[PDB]
Ligand binder design. Structure first.
Ligand SMILES: Nc1ncnc2c1ncn2[C@@H]1O[C@H](COP(=O)(O)OP(=O)(O)O)[C@@H](O)[C@H]1O
Lengths: 250, 239, 238, 239, 230, 70, 228, 240, 248
């Protein structure tokens, strides 16, 4: 995520770590960033690491947590979450799968969904006490989201998280294998090449499955063959077949 | 669960036609069983005649019907749906008889009836008919046929079958009869059917409580057995 | 309610509440009275006023030299049914030069009104009708309802505030059979006045009358014509 | 009873789906037409020709008569549908009627077609509005506007689309009650608005002119830029 | 979801009801179709749920023409409808052109039919997927037609229960140079590999297209390949 | 709303399945009658350790169950 | 009970057509007066911008040389109803050569209006006044989406119908000259409806029995303007 | 509620619970009974009076099917009128086509199909009525058939419909209709109707009788009870 | 509900269902028509991926309407098949009337009007098919046209639809070539765009289906490319990327 990580360092870290420029520039600091990509592409990981380096506090609420079963509850949750963030010094607010409460609602109950997304937009728009307060949003497959939050005065930037490529697969396999007992004769590059279009999370999966193959055999070490049969379990996309593979949604 | 069963032309997430199985319930119609057996030169159907009240005329409450001098039909289902289905059977039999010059084969007639039931199954215009019909016939020098025809639009020929209140018991009893090697006479076939009905139902079976239709190669006329014949068979199996 | 959107849907009560709602729509219309004698059959309608400078709406229609109607319902449905009776009487006179018997006309009305009551997406005809006629078999007063039911009544009243008029007609039914035209028409006018509130009474504005007899073509008397019938009739004391 | 439909009314009584059609018109680009002393001129904006998108093909201006001309602002599919219908109607009227077409009749035709299409269940209204300019007003110019409600009105000068709020006021500011002498002056006036609406880029002014006796006339971008330069000289006077 | 109606798109542009039709497919009886070098073999399962059902009285492999064979994985009645339609369409092609209809043309016509059942608001598509084996101008053809109205070219494929097992099996154990007998052997092998329960003359039925003619193997031949072989 | 909410339920289950923090030894156990359904996100290798198939008892097994209970 | 006219309320009323009456209410106001001298109609244009041709909005029309009309409501299909009225007069007169009674013209328009649940759409959400003269009497008539229709002496429909109707009722009597009726109606329109009279938003059309020509008021308002 | 909303979908426990609602509507109506004597068929019906407003002998519920076919109904009255119309149409069709009078089995089965087919289609509803048809064929026998809202047609020696199905059947079961003839059958029918709630709670009603018998010529007529009112006297003697 | 039926707009006036149709298009196998002169081409790599798929037509993405007219597919399969057949009948109608080859824009209109007429009626589903046309006619000769589900049509010298459509059109705009950009350069640019848009390294010949129109003898010829030329073109682009590396 080096390109993505650099963009998010800029937009988040610079106002928090070096506000003076934005004072000298006079411009108000940017408020937040939306993160979009296929599920499992390190979005929460990136937000968590950014919060850790920036030394400010991490507060999380998934969009699905906002809904609730009663009217006037999402608004209360959002407002008191902003109160918590403000009370918690410099802080980044993280909201996973925000699309769950931001989507096509003009179809038409649904009332509280709007009364929640509008309330969140009101909290961020009024730049309420935004002295070192930032928000981070995460979405799977941006398209389902709506522009009401992306409108220029509102949240400012978007970052794309495409599925990891060969080099990214190399990193992620290395990082999640760093703790596992690996053996000479391993060829991890063949493994990364053999896993086209991974989402990153399933590479944590392939490491997990190679280790499970070691464990169920009571072996505390992993080899090339273990990972190679692991990847077979990690395919799981062979369950496509005739249905819609080349017809309809070809 | 709710939603894929409110209308007929809807596939479930697993692809299940809910309304087809749902119409399959009305086939129960507690009171009839329609056991049909094929023997070396005969085809026999017997249905259970559950009359709730005495004042009804016994002839009107019959459930066996004919569409050909050599074809017999029996019914298990909602009585009105029953009579509509057999009337469509008359319609098709008459049209085939006019068009081809000779009466419809039983396999083709089951095919036509199942075809119409499938037609109402595939299209939401009309409810599928909640009834199951069974046909007995003869085909030239080749054999007697027993055919079951269902609202799903499915149909098949059998050594024997029974769509009735004691479904699995009757079917397993007939399998047990056929999974042991034996011959098949007219009286032996009727005996197998009557023993099935009596054993699965466990009732003492006075004559008026059942109705028997039959066809036989030596006398290919479709006949409804008179009370005397059915009581003779009852005492034959009783002793 | 779950089972009250269309007449095609039965209720667990063994009822069709939409037909009853059509009955209530009929009850929304103003009261009308019908009564017959051995000499004449008369119907009278309470013409609802709209303002002091607008015509009081017509509620008695003429379709045949021996047949008349008084309506209580949505005016469109009643008047197009009136066109339907126009068609049938005209084609009957075409076919065999016969003034169409009232009973068979009313039966045809019921049969045609029955069709919407058993089909989806088509409103049953939300009007109640009183039909007056004289024919080769007798004098005739019928009532028809959106349930397609049709009845023969020696006296009848349909519409809002009708209960008092129906009771008055029940009392004077013992009279009407041998009553003369003048007696019958004045009793019908009083039957209508029974419906009204205390401050509302018979006047040329609110009253319309239609008469059929063994010696006169069914005629509707309105405005000036109503004046001689009301004059000489007893006023209302408190 | 909320809107949720085309043929139902909210308790207020207004058809909100017609409102949705007029907003669908509102999301379209600018379109401002006028009539002059003798001539009628038009210039469309927002070409936004993106490289391989050769601007000619989309045909922002269509002339469908021996002499009449307009496209439709909104969604262009219904625009081309009404284009085909206008072709058929104008040619058929010219063939069948003792005298050729007039602008009033064809505008009434478009309005009636839109109304008739709207007035039914399961039939989407044309969410398109248009400005029609024609010559045979007894040899005089006149301009009409058509609205998805199936409505037709007459204008001396009208604007619809993204500039409807702005350009109309512009017209209310400066449409001279003096009949426009030197109809090229009217062309300069309308080009001013047609440019100023879209950022006065000078690239999307795509323009047609008809002197109420002529056939279709078109203005190339350089010749339109001539009027643009004259308008710039007029605007530079404030010094 | 967007499944109670067929004539409306989902926000992701997915016709959901037809994928429910495809889910109805592969829930039915297993079937496998393979193109050999010379012939085309379609095998299907015909176990009777009880000894009551007469295995010699019903068939699932059907000759649409003397050079076309059809096999299916779905509920029977819809397959009967489409068999009737395909037979009439082939006969009408014969009447129009005075030529026996080639495999591809009949396949695209049946696909167009299955298409015309994919619209409107008061009907449903057929819940059946079809293998068409044919001979045309000396060339053998195998085609698959599916409820969406589309069709695919296969040298080998399978559907029904355990169909993914069939895809894997024909991926491993297949080459286009197969002789006819080895092709039928592969067909019964994949049928068993997808199958659960015993297999004999009464349990399986197969149909072979050869350029001279197509024919449905008798139960005895289905046993000869089925038993004492493999 | 029922459909959206059930989808949010399964997604929230997914986030909790991946979310529980290390050194906590909880085990999520899953029961199902069919398992030809079930979205391929529980079968993902990073969440599924073993898939154990519980058939209707056959001979031998039925004998064992009868003996044990009786 | 919201999908259409084919559903009845617990009180019987159809919850579709009352909305059509309220659709009358959203339209421009319209007035009509019946006098023994002549029958007159008035209408407000609501000219959105004077850059429009004020005559373009056909809120005042002539069905025929003896009969004129005004309407209030959605307007769009009101023109269709005027078309039906004109075809009715054309056909009936060309066939029978007897003049169409304005009562009969309104009856034919009503017969058209009864085509939303009575055969095999939606009610025409607009109301109309007709003013006509005939060999038996000069009359004015009123029409509403339900298809019912009534003879009236002084009628008002559209927006602000109630107040204009009250004033019109108070000024009316049975022996007025058409000049006094016109002046009273115009001053009422000025006080309650919009503003002082001008040629680009008000319209008047009047008809007399012996006059089959110029059933309109046009390019002569100046005398009123100085002498209203 | 479930899936019992129209008569084209099998509701849970496949019985539709719709045509059963039509039967519930049938139960609301007053009783009609029908007997077959040794050589004839008789029908006896009670009908409510609207009020003293009502004209005597109006909206009566006996109906003529054919010159020799008689009708008795219960349930929705107007649906019964429409059923009488279509039954007359069917009888006329057979009369015109075959050239001789229709056997009542065929006509009854065709009307049963009409009712049944009306039960299916989604745009329509099952009939809210059930009815008996009676006739005599001098060539071979007498005939009676009863039909429910579902379309089920059966024959009876004695049958009853209305608000007193089973009670009326208990009343009928102990008659000697096995050999008894119609002339006292009318008296027995009138007294049986008066036995089951003549005017106990419902104030007043009208009693109508229909007859088809060889002694009646085998045609359909309304029994002249004006003759000495013997059945009326017997039914009012039923007091105790 | 608004988006449940095709006849309902948004309160903003938009139509959701056609938008859903273009989102559906977003799935389709990547296919483009390239910018070229004195010739045209419409490359369409087949998204079908299984070694046991037989591709017996050698063409499932390009359909020849006439020897001077060809069209592609990007969307629903059965809808596309019936629509291409209908293209053939409409072209047959025009030819059988006039005995003259149809102009490109006229056929494009006729189809798009038919599609719009299907969409705007109720009880019917909009066609989820976007498609491209290459053709030569008397009025304008070489032409490439775009069409969407709503019945819209446009003229494009080079365009692409399917997966990564935005990326393909954007890079076509980045390395835009004009004028001397004849047919062979268009084949090279199509190779470049197919290599960039697809994830496959060393793009395989069977994955791609290519067609081109060239005016032979004034009678015109439309070729669907075989294996050999495809292999040559892709290998040449690989070694061209190697050459681009040689500059380093
Ligand atoms: N580039 C990466 N390096 C290391 N781990 C990763 C990477 N991408 C994803 N992961 C693992 O996969 C998970 C991705 O979660 P996330 O992408 O936030 O899911 P969602 O898309 O549902 O928000 C992380 O918890 C992390 O452990």
């Amino acid at each position: 995520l080096d390109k993505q990580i650099k963009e998010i360092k800029e937009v988040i870290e610079l106002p928090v770590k070096h506000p003076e420029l934005f004072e000298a520039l006079g411009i108000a600091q940017p408020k937040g960033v939306l993160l979009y990509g296929p599920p499992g592409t390190g979005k929460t990981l990136l937000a968590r690491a950014v919060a850790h380096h920036t030394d400010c506090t991490f507060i999380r609420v998934s969009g699905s947590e906002l809904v609730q079963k009663f009217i006037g509850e999402g608004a209360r949750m959002v407002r008191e979450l902003f109160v918590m963030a403000r009370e918690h010094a410099p802080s980044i607010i993280f909201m996973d799968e925000i699309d769950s409460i931001g989507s096509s609602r003009l179809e038409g109950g649904d009332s509280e969904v709007q009364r929640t997304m509008l309330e969140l937009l009101n909290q961020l728009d009024g730049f309420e006490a935004t002295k070192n307060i930032k928000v981070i949003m995460a979405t799977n497959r941006i398209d389902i989201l709506d522009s009401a939050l992306l409108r220029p005065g509102r949240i400012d930037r978007k970052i794309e998280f495409p599925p990891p490529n060969e080099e990214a697969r190399l990193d992620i396999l290395k990082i999640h294998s760093r703790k596992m007992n690996l053996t000479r004769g391993i060829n991890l590059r063949k493994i990364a090449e053999l896993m086209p279009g991974a989402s990153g999370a399933e590479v944590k999966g392939v490491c997990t499955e190679a280790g499970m193959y070691a464990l169920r055999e009571r072996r505390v070490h992993v080899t090339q063959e273990d990972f190679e049969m692991a990847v077979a379990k990690v395919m799981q996309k062979d369950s496509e077949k005739n249905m819609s593979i080349k017809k309809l949604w070809k | 669960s709710a939603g894929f069963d409110r209308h007929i032309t809807i596939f479930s997430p697993e692809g299940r036609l809910y309304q087809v199985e749902y119409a399959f319930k009305a086939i129960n119609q507690g009171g009839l069983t329609s056991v049909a057996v094929r023997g070396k030169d005969c085809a026999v159907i017997v249905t259970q005649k559950k009359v709730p009240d005495k004042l009804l005329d016994s002839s009107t409450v019959t459930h066996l019907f004919k569409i050909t001098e050599n074809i017999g039909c029996v019914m298990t289902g909602m009585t009105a749906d029953s009579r509509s289905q057999v009337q469509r059977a008359r319609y098709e039999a008459a049209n085939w008889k006019y068009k081809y010059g000779y009466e419809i084969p039983v396999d083709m007639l089951c095919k036509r009836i199942a075809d119409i039931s499938q037609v109402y199954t595939q299209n939401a215009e009309m409810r599928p008919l909640g009834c199951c019909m069974i046909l007995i016939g003869i085909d030239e020098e080749q054999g007697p046929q027993v055919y079951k025809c269902d609202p799903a639009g499915y149909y098949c020929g059998f050594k024997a079958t029974a769509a009735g209140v004691k479904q699995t018991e009757s079917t397993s009893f007939l399998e047990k009869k056929v999974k042991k090697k034996f011959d098949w006479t007219f009286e032996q076939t009727v005996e197998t059917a009557i023993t099935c009905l009596s054993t699965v139902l466990s009732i003492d079976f006075k004559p008026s409580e059942i109705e028997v239709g039959v066809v036989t190669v030596e006398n290919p006329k479709f006949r409804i057995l008179t009370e005397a014949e059915i009581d003779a068979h009852l005492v034959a199996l009783a002793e | 309610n779950q089972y009250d959107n269309d007449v095609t849907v039965w209720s667990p009560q063994g009822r069709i509440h939409q037909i009853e709602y059509a009955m209530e729509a009929v009850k929304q219309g103003s009261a009308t009275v019908g009564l017959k004698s051995k000499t004449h059959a008369v119907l009278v309608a309470l013409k609802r006023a709209q303002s002091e400078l607008a015509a009081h709406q017509k509620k008695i229609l003429h379709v045949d030299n021996h047949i008349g109607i008084s309506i209580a319902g949505l005016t469109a449905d009643a008047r197009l049914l009136c066109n339907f009776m126009r068609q049938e009487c005209l084609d009957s006179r075409f076919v065999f030069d016969r003034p169409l018997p009232v009973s068979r006309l009313v039966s045809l009305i019921g049969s045609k009104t029955q069709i919407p009551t058993q089909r989806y997406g088509r409103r049953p005809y939300g009007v109640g009708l009183l039909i007056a006629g004289y024919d080769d078999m007798g004098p005739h007063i019928f009532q028809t309802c959106p349930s397609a039911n049709y009845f023969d009544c020696r006296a009848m009243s349909i519409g809002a505030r009708s209960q008092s008029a129906r009771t008055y007609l029940e009392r004077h039914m013992s009279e009407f059979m041998e009553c003369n035209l003048n007696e019958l028409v004045k009793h019908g006018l009083r039957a209508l006045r029974e419906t009204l509130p205390a401050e509302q009474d018979l006047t040329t504005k609110n009253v319309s009358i239609g008469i059929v007899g063994k010696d006169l073509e069914f005629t509707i008397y309105d405005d000036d014509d109503v004046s001689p019938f009301l004059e000489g009739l007893e006023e209302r004391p408190q | 009873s909320y809107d949720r439909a085309i043929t139902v009314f909210s308790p207020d009584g207004h058809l909100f789906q017609v409102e949705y059609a007029q907003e669908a018109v509102k999301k379209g680009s600018t379109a401002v037409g006028v009539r002059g002393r003798d001539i009628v001129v038009l210039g469309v904006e927002k070409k936004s020709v993106a490289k391989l998108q050769d601007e000619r093909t989309v045909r922002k201006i269509c002339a469908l008569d021996d002499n009449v001309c307009m496209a439709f602002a909104g969604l262009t599919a219904d625009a081309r549908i009404v284009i085909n219908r206008a072709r058929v109607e104008c040619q058929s009227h010219r063939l069948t009627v003792e005298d050729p077409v007039t602008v009033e009749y064809i505008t009434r035709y478009i309005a009636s077609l839109k109304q008739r299409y709207t007035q039914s269940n399961g039939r989407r209204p044309f969410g398109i509005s248009a400005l029609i300019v024609g010559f045979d007003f007894d040899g005089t110019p006149r301009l009409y506007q058509t609205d998805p409600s199936g409505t037709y009105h007459a204008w001396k000068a009208n604007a619809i689309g993204r500039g409807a709020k702005s350009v109309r006021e512009f017209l209310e500011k400066n449409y001279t009650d003096e009949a426009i002498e030197t109809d090229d002056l009217t062309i300069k006036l309308v080009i001013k608005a047609l440019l100023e609406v879209v950022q006065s880029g000078g690239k999307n002014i795509e323009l047609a002119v008809m002197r109420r006796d002529q056939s279709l006339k078109i203005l190339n971008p350089e010749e339109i830029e001539k009027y643009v330069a004259e308008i710039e000289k007029e605007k530079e006077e404030n010094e | 979801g967007y499944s109670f109606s067929l004539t409306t798109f989902s926000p992701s542009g997915k016709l959901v009801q037809i994928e429910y039709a495809l889910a109805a497919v592969a829930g039915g009886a297993p079937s496998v179709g393979i193109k050999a070098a010379n012939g085309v073999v379609l095998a299907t399962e015909k176990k009777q749920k009880s000894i009551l059902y007469d295995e010699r009285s019903v068939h699932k492999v059907e000759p649409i023409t003397k050079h076309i064979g059809l096999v299916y994985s779905g509920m029977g009645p819809d397959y009967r409808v489409l068999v009737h339609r395909a037979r009439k369409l082939a006969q009408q092609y014969y009447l129009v052109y005075q030529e026996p209809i080639p495999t591809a043309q009949l396949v695209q016509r049946v696909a167009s039919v299955m298409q015309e059942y994919t619209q409107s608001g008061g009907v449903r598509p057929f819940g059946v997927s079809l293998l068409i084996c044919g001979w045309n101008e000396g060339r053998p053809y195998l085609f698959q037609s599916d409820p969406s109205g589309a069709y695919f070219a296969w040298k080998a494929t399978a559907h029904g229960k355990n169909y993914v097992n069939g895809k894997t099996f024909l991926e491993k154990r297949y080459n286009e140079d197969l002789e006819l007998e080895d092709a039928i052997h592969t067909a019964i092998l994949t049928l068993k590999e997808s199958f659960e329960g015993q297999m004999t003359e009464d349990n399986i039925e197969v149909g072979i297209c050869n350029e001279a003619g197509f024919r449905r193997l008798t139960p005895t031949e289905v046993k000869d390949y089925l038993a004492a072989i493999a | 709303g029922a459909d959206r909410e059930v989808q949010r339920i399964l997604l929230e289950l997914l986030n909790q399945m991946d979310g529980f923090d290390q050194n906590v030894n909880v085990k999520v156990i899953m029961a199902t009658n069919r398992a030809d359904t079930l979205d391929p996100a529980l079968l993902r290798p990073g969440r599924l350790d073993r898939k154990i198939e519980f058939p209707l008892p056959d001979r031998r097994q039925k004998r064992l169950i009868f003996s044990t209970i009786t | 009970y919201d999908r259409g006219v084919n559903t009845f309320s617990p009180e019987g009323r159809l919850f579709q057509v009352e909305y059509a009456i309220e659709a009358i209410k959203l339209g421009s106001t319209a007035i009509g007066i019946q006098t023994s001298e002549g029958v007159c109609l008035a209408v407000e244009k609501r000219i959105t911008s004077p850059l429009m041709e004020p005559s373009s909005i056909e809120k005042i029309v002539e069905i025929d040389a003896h009969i004129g009309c005004a309407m209030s409501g959605l307007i769009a299909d009101a023109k269709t109803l005027i078309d039906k009225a004109r075809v009715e007069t054309q056909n009936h007169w060309f066939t029978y050569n007897e003049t169409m009674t304005v009562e009969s013209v309104t009856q034919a328009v009503s017969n058209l209006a009864l085509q939303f649940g009575e055969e095999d759409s939606r009610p025409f959400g607009v109301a109309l006044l007709f003013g006509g003269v005939d060999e038996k009497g000069p009359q004015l008539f009123h029409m509403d989406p339900s298809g019912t229709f009534v003879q009236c002496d002084a009628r008002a429909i559209g927006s602000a119908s109630e107040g204009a109707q009250s004033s019109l009722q108070e000024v009316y009597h049975k022996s007025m000259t058409l000049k006094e009726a016109i002046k009273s109606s115009l001053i009422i329109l000025k006080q309650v409806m919009e503003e002082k009279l001008n040629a680009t938003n008000i319209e008047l059309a009047t008809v007399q029995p012996g006059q089959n020509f110029h059933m309109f008021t046009k390019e002569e308002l100046e005398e009123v303007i100085k002498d209203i | 509620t479930g899936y019992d909303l129209s008569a084209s979908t099998f509701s849970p426990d496949g019985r539709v619970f719709q045509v059963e609602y039509a039967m519930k509507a049938v139960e609301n109506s007053s009783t009609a009974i029908g007997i077959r004597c040794k050589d004839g068929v008789v029908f006896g019906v009670e009908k409510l009076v609207l009020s003293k407003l009502y004209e005597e002998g109006s909206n009566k519920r006996l109906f003529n099917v054919d010159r020799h076919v008689g009708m008795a109904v219960a349930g929705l009255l107007a649906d019964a009128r429409s059923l009488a119309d279509i039954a007359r149409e069917e009888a006329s069709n057979f009369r015109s086509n075959f050239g001789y009078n229709i056997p009542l089995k065929h006509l009854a089965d065709r009307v049963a199909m009409y009712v049944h087919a009306y039960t299916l289609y989604s745009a329509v509803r099952p009939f809210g009525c059930s009815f008996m048809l009676g006739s005599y064929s001098v060539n071979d026998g007498a005939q009676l058939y009863m039909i429910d809202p579902s379309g089920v047609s059966y024959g009876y020696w004695g049958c009853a419909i209305g608000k007193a199905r089973q009670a009326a059947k208990t009343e009928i079961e102990k008659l000697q209709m096995k050999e008894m003839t119609c002339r006292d059958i009318v008296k027995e029918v009138a007294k049986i109707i008066y036995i089951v709630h003549d005017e106990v709670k419902d104030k007043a009603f009208e009693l109508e009788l229909s007859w088809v018998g060889e002694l009646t010529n085998g045609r359909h007529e309304i029994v002249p009870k004006d003759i000495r009112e013997e059945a009326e006297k017997y039914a009012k003697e039923s007091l105790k | 509900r608004y988006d449940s039926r095709t006849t309902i707009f948004s309160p903003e006036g938009r139509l959701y269902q056609v938008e859903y149709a273009m989102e559906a298009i977003g799935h389709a196998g990547t296919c483009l028509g390239i910018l070229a002169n004195d010739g045209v081409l419409l490359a369409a790599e087949r998204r079908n991926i299984h070694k046991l798929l037989d591709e017996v037509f050698f063409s499932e993405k390009i359909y020849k309407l006439n020897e001077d007219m060809a069209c592609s597919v990007a969307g629903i399969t059965s809808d596309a098949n019936v629509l291409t057949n209908e293209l053939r009948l409409i072209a047959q109608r025009y030819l059988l009337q006039y005995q003259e080859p149809i102009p490109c824009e006229q056929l494009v209109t006729a189809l798009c009007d038919i599609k719009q007429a299907y969409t705007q009626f109720g009880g019917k589903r909009p066609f989820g098919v976007s498609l491209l046309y290459i053709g030569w006619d008397k009025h304008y000769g070489f032409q490439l046209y775009q069409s969407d589900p709503s019945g819209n049509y446009g003229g494009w010298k080079a365009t692409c639809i399917g997966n990564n459509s935005a990326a393909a059109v954007s890079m076509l705009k980045q390395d835009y070539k004009e004028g001397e950009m004849t047919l062979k350069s268009a084949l090279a640019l199509a190779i470049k765009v197919l290599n960039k848009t697809m994830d496959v390294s060393k793009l395989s010949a069977e994955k791609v289906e290519i067609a081109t129109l060239t005016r032979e003898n004034g009678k015109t010829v439309i070729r669907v490319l075989k294996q050999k030329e495809v292999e040559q073109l892709i290998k040449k682009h690989e070694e061209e990327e190697a050459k681009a590396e040689r500059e380093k």
